[PDB]
Design an enzyme around this catalytic site. Sequence first.
Site, short mmCIF file in Angstrom:
data_model
loop_
_atom_site.label_atom_id
_atom_site.label_comp_id
_atom_site.label_asym_id
_atom_site.label_seq_id
_atom_site.Cartn_x
_atom_site.Cartn_y
_atom_site.Cartn_z
N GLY A 138 50.46 -51.63 58.57
CA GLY A 138 50.89 -50.57 57.72
C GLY A 138 51.50 -50.67 56.23
O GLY A 138 52.47 -50.76 56.97
N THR A 139 50.84 -49.79 55.58
CA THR A 139 52.18 -49.47 54.47
C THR A 139 53.09 -48.51 54.56
O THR A 139 53.50 -48.09 56.24
CB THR A 139 51.47 -48.14 53.32
OG1 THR A 139 50.19 -49.25 52.35
CG2 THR A 139 51.86 -47.50 52.85
N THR A 140 53.89 -48.98 53.83
CA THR A 140 55.32 -48.09 54.73
C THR A 140 54.83 -46.67 53.99
O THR A 140 54.96 -46.06 52.60
CB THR A 140 55.84 -48.40 54.11
OG1 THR A 140 57.84 -48.31 54.73
CG2 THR A 140 57.12 -49.14 52.72
N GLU A 169 54.04 -45.97 50.17
CA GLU A 169 53.32 -46.46 49.27
C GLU A 169 51.78 -47.44 49.35
O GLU A 169 51.57 -48.02 50.01
CB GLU A 169 54.18 -48.43 50.01
CG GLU A 169 53.13 -49.45 49.55
CD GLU A 169 54.39 -50.51 50.73
OE1 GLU A 169 55.11 -51.73 50.10
OE2 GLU A 169 54.32 -50.85 51.87
#
Lengths: 238, 242, 235, 198, 230, 204, 246, 212, 230
Positions: B28-30, B45
């Site tokens: 997933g997104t950071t 993000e």
Amino acid sequence: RALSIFSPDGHIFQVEYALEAVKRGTCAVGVKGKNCVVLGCERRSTLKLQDTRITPSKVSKIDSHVVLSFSGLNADSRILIEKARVEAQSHRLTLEDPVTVEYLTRYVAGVQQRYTQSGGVRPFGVSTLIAGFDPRDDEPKLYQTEPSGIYSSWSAQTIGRNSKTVREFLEKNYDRKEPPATVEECVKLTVRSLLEVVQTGAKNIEITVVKPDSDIVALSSEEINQYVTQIEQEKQEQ
Amino acid sequence: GYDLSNSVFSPDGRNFQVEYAVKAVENGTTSIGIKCNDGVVFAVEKLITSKLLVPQKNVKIQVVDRHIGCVYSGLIPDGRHLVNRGREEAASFKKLYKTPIPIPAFADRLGQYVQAHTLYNSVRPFGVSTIFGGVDKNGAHLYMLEPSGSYWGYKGAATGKGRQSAKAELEKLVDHHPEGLSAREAVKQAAKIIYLAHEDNKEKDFELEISWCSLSETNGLHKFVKGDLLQEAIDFAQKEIN
Amino acid sequence: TIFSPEGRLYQVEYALESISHAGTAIGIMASDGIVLAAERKVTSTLLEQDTSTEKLYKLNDKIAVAVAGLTADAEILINTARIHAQNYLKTYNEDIPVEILVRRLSDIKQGYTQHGGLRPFGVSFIYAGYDDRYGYQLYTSNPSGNYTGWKAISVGANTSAAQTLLQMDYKDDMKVDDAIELALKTLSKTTDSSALTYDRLEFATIRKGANDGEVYQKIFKPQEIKDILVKTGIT
Amino acid sequence: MDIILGIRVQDSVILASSKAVTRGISVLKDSDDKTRQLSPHTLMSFAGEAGDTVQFAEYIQANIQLYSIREDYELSPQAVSSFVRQELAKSIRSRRPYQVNVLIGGYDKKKNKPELYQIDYLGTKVELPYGAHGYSGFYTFSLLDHHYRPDMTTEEGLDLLKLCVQELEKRMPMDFKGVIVKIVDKDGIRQVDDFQAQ
Amino acid sequence: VSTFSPEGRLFQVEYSLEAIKLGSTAIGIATKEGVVLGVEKRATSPLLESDSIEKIVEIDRHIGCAMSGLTADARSMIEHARTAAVTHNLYYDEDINVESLTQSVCDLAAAAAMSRPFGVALLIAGHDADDGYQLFHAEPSGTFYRYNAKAIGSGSEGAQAELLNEWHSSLTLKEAELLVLKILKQVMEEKLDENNAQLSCITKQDGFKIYDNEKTAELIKELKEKEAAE
Amino acid sequence: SDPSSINGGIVVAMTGKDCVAIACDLRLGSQSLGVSNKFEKIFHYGHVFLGITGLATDVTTLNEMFRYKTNLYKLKEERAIEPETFTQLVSSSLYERRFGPYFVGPVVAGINSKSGKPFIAGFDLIGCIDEAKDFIVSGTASDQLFGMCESLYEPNLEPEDLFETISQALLNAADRDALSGWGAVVYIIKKDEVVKRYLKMRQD
Amino acid sequence: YSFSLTTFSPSGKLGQIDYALTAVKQGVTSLGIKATNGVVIATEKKSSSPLAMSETLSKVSLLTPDIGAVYSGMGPDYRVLVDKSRKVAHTSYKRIYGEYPPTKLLVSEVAKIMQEATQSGGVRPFGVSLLIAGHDEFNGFSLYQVDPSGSYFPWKATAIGKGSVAAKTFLEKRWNDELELEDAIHIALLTLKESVEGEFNGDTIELAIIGDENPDLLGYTGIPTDKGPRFRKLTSQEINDRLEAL
Amino acid sequence: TTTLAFRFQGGIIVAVDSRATAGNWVASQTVKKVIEINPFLLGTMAGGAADCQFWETWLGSQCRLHELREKERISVAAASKILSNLVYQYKGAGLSMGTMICGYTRKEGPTIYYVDSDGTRLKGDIFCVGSGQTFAYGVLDSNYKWDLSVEDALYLGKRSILAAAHRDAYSGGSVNLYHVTEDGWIYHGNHDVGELFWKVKEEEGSFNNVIG
Amino acid sequence: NYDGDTVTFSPTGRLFQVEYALEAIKQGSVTVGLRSNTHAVLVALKRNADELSSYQKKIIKCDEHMGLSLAGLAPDARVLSNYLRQQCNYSSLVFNRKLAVERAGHLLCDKAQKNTQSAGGRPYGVGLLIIGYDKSGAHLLEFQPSGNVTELYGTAIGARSQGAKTYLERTLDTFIKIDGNPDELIKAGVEAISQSLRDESLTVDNLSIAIVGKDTPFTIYDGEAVAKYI
Ligand SMILES: [Mg+2]
Ligand SMILES: [Mg+2]
Ligand SMILES: [Mg+2]
Ligand SMILES: [Mg+2]
């Protein structure tokens, strides 16, 4: 846990297998006369030294005018019977009129049906022949119920091992124009049918007759034997 | 077969289903957090899959009570769940003790809840990792929680895909500023670190999101970075990005 | 609690198997009493047989049962048995008819058969009982929840063997003293061990002494078994 | 309240029950039967609160009828009555107690003797030669205590009831519109339709 | 029993639908003069009394339904359907809408808080003031569709195809009667007589009426004649 | 309205040299109306006697209850229950209903088959145990009974004498109670034997 | 997991029970020897490191002042079983009759616990076997052994766990129905010695007896009906004093 | 309120008044005290308006359910035992109702059951319920004969109400008549008592004490 | 092996069951959603099983200010909309406040999630486009059974949705500015739904449109009334 479930072919195995247990059970039959219904059954013979006096008989009274016989796991039947008996009284108590054979049947049927779509319970290994007469009526009633929950009426029908064979006997020996118009002949016919599978036996067969207005009576080992003899005669006379 | 059911210990004493949950997290997104001198900043993000997205709307950071900020990476929905329970767990604390829930306390509450999902095979662990924190009676606090229910306190923390790039950047900050870091600084910094970390996902245009909880900049309450203050950091990042 | 493709209840079938490995119990229904005899499973010189009760249990002053299977599973079924007995007595102020008690116990077993997901009880029972409606009766219940009544019957190890021996020597007009003998004989010939000895037996009767009116249940004491043994000649 | 009397002679039990149902200011019916046949050889008469009265009776009937089917046997009067006492004894400590009193007369086909049981709403059960509930006892017991004899014929008892019914109609303030009598003996349960004049 | 396939379908539901394909053909056709529901009896022997086969039931005066599949499963469904129409009449003093009724039935369907789906489908036909004569097919999935004519059960594939051909927005009650009869005949293994097929219809004026064998026979006959034309 | 005085009745039990006695009247009434003169209030489970005075329905219930309980006790323990033990059972069984009790006053009498020591005891409607070596009284005429007992009673009487004593006590006491009488029964209990005698008394 | 984990196998065996019996088989040996005026039950204090403290592990336990229990198999399963045993001693008994239950009854209750483990959904049998010794006014002295199946039976003497067979054998030769307590103790010690691998002394052995009443262990003087508990555990010193007389 | 139902040759006559009061206040003179359960069964209103109107309307439903289940007209006996048993379930709660369940079936013939919130269910030939009962009973008792004609019987009921409407303060308004037959019931109008008293007085000659 | 339930993450950290659920959506007819700054339209291409049935209703009103279009397993849509109706209702009754679309979204997500974390359950297998006007303007939300909700200017879901999704992805600058005129917004909505067609042209039974905005309450235009949009 869901035991009775569908399969890729559209079957509920447990229900289907339930039927097998029905086949393994002894035979039971019932044919309805013109003003009576009779139900005969063959006795189990795995071990013999039984005390006939007490042993749970195969035909049971649901109420004074309705009886039920079955073919299958003997235990599973008892339950069906109790639930039916208790419902018989309850109907009386709240409707001030005893159950009609149909109603009783539909009751027993629904019970079985229920066990086919309830978790944690395996279907009933049983099929029943319920018969009797509606209150203040004379038209005889014979009904059949299976583990699926399906039920219907029959001029004559049978269940249990070799039911197919005897069913056939009936399919041609019972004409819906002259139903066995006498207690005697209806018995004859049932016996005749029963003989085709029972295999020459007195205590092997038990025959129960049901007449209108709570008139029910099981024939004694010997009353039956007399029919057996007269039947082997209308066989040997040729 | 030791990886089909949750509560199962393998021959080496690892709970595989947990570790798999971790994978959902990695995919997933950071997101990150930087415990600063008197507060903490959170940033994440938001990947813009299409022009069809309404800009600056699908907020992902969340607040618990009024002083805790929460951001997580993984199966988004699993995050929300973790937060709702956080909220119930925080209310319950206030109702009975009057003072809003202390971060250490809150974390442990979230901890115990997640850990519970690694105790029965009838449950799957959480597919997310959460970074959260805030200000309380005695200091700022930043924590990160992993699907095993394991959590610890951080100087800086990050997670998701850009995780390593981000951690690298954070490591720099810790060694270069042991004194602390003003909330303002940490803001821009996070903006940066996210921009940088974005490179491990350098294929789609993004939308930054930052929030902070500072004892001098937001009175100890959790507020979102918007307007003048947000643009400033967006540009500060676009600057040192080359 | 599921069905086989053949139409059989696995766990039930298997239960019956467990049972066949259990000591033998016999119940012989005479004209003036009923006998129950049972050969004890696993023993030793050190086992205290004096203060023992593992196969013959009193249910009510008028009903006793012999056990074949898991002792523990049995006791559970028994306790509830003893209870239904008393409930009926309280409700009606008459001792419970044997079949009623038996049918009730059966119904429980059947339950385990049809629903729940619990393993059936690894037990079979022989009920020796008396009542003002049918006098002496001998019953048997097994794991499927099925029950039936007999003139003589056995359960546990070597049924066919013993069943065949009984069917041979039993006759409608028997007397207790004779049934006792028969019981011993049968056990004696269907044992899986050296020789029948008092220490390996459990024996009990339900007689209605002519010099009175109420039925008397006598659970034989070790010495008496040793005695009843010498007389019958097992020595 | 209503009148419920019972007297067991030598070969039978006779029960008499007033025929009046009063609701408030008027008499609604003058031909009520305050009894139910439990089994073909046991009868139960009842008196008490409006609804509880029939409801209890019918419940008991049903349950006795069910035992009869399940077992192919007719419980003894004694059994039937211990069953009833228990049901009442259970209701006195319930949410809302059935306010009912009953008399149970039965012929015990096994002992070949008649039996009369008196049970009140509290579950107090007692076996007697003759009995009644409420005030009915007050007027008649003196008569019963005086003329009753164990070896009475069915006819002797019917007359004693008559004399009793007479005293009630003389000294009791309310008009119970007469009584319906029934006898329980070895051959069954019959209704002496001649108690308006016998 | 709640597991999805890689294709995105519920197994037990798909299988449940297969069991239905094994059942007696049920057909209903919806006109502007009514809705006909006809079914095929299918007795497992000639000893069985053909009249004790109930596959077309009255839900309420203005709603009837035909069934196909494991028929016993349908008992609870009818019960519920009836209770609901009634209850709706009690609370609102009016006739329930066919759709609502149906929806009510389906609402029951997916409650997989009964070990397995129902192995039976229904053709609910009825009439209400706002939406006129309507025909609905209810599946164990919990889904239901309105059709102008529809067949379900063993011979549904051919039947549906034939329906597609015979139906036009302007048949008369009699016409449809015949078709159901016809199509029933085309897909029945046994020869169509009045003791093995059953017709029923529901009209504004007289409501849900199940045809008496005699009336049916007259149509069967009327059919043999109209068919043996060319 | 006081359930303990509706049906009336009394019971008393006494101890002697190697024996105990327990007696009771036989009246069962409904307020003023005597209803039966054959309502024994003493029961036994083996060699243990339990007399119960109080609301007759509870008297019946409790009796049925202890039979039940004493029966299972026998099956489980393979031996008959002892006085001391039955007492604790009664007590606990009554306290079990501490907030909706059985309106009764039980008295227990028996001889422990092992020690031979005579034993009697009594309780109030909720289990309060009263263990005196002399006498125990219960019923609508407890006052009368105590008065009698206190004066008539002396220790170590023989079966035959204790009998007179307890009869008198019961008799006279009952004579001064409206709700008791119509007959009286007396049990003289010894290790080996038990004799039961009915007394002749005023039928008013 | 609401279904029985212990099911019937086609041969007619209860898998989990036999396995539990296996676990029992591996446990340290324990014995019980019933004399005329007493009973002794002993075991070995298998110290899993000399750093652990021996005393803090009661392998032998008082269930009631007149009933003790020792085991073989999984200690934990035993520990919880003793708790439940002492409990039921009160609930199903002291709170109803004001006296503690008789050995066979308690034993019967314990059994009931283990059976439930054999049939209730979602559990495994107890991996223990206990030897329960006690006394009661009416049945005198008794010793019982209880198995994971729930099966229980009385003995004159027996042993369980590791060296059961060897031990049972030795017991079988020395036991007779005229044994005074000291002697059975002796024999218990002797029997113990052969199954014990290393040091055999008062700190590695655990003997407890059920004998005459100990007023000195009551805690109060006054009421004379109860003269004290019969269960007494042996001291390191008392054990050694006897060992020295080998 | 006054309601009567009596059985006879041609069937059943149900007649009720139509006055509802709240103390001394006449709330309505146009209340329908006959709850039309279904085309064959009639229920009367007395006690609680809501209680009757509600539970009898409901009864109307339960009967329908039964007629779908069994394809046979529910018997009055059954019809009434349902209400009755329901009512007995709430006994003690404070339901107030006393009503006649009237019906004419093939099996039973004409039938009237009195059912009340105390749990009483009774079968009878004549029943009057309400504050004005005694007045209607008075008339009914003396002019009641089984051999009555439908016309006379209607009148008898109509009059019995009149009687009560005159003397009882809590009854009046108008009389509603219903004849129950085997093919169902037939309404026989609403007759305003005002106009009816004068007419009857004039024609019959009664109520002489009244001036007019 | 790893696709038996939703309580099992695979070794790559996926929830197959959820994923399989998402695939249930792709086999449903396309439904489009698009909004301007004053209106929100829902154009849903309805589907037919045969030429004699109904084109399954894809649009459900949840409150006078909100509604949704479904694609997938209808039952689930009913369950989800109903839950949505209740929550909208609760806001009205208790706070006399119209539920914020975003808020509704948060709710559906949370609801779906629970069915993707517990044994015995099954993810919902239906997608929904929710439009609604509130205190902060026009809104369009896309809901996926995984539990993910996203706010969009426009979109579509179902079989071949990707066609309309690009149309809108380009036409944005054009429709985001269709304020004050609903007809156009709808036209666009149709024009979009057509770039995901193939079977045939959208017909008068095919079409289903829902609009809501400034001075326009959630209204369902079915059949006849959409004629002017083809
Ligand atoms: Mg006092
Ligand atoms: Mg006196
Ligand atoms: Mg006097
Ligand atoms: Mg007036």
